[PDB]
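PROTOCOL LOG
Step 1. Enter all chains and additional molecules of the complex.
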Amino acid sequence: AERLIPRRPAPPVPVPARIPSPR
Amino acid sequence: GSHMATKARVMYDFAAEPGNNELTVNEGEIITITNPDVGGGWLEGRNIKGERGLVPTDYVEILPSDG
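Step 2. Run joint prediction.
Step 3. Record the structure below.
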C-alpha cells in the first residue's frame, strides 16, 4: 500500500483474564 | 471524526521492533490514531513527540468522540 503495514501478527498481551469477556 | 483525529490510551507497556516500523508506548499514555484497521491485530498511531508507527490494538483502547 501507500501506507504502513504489519510484517507479523500482533504479540500476546498481559490482560488479567482467567476467562475472556462475554461482551 | 467531526473535524478531529481519533485517539487511544495504552493498556500495557510496549516496545517497537526496528524491522517492523512499530511505535514504542507506555501504559496510560495517550496517542493519536492514524489507522484503526491495518490487519493482523494492529493499528497506526502517533505520540506527543511526533513519531508514528504500528501498535498492537489489544495493547490499547480507542477513546470516545465529543470529549
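Step 4. Note key features.
Chain A touches chain B through twelve residues (CB under 8 Å).
The two ends of chain A are 33 Å apart (CA to CA).
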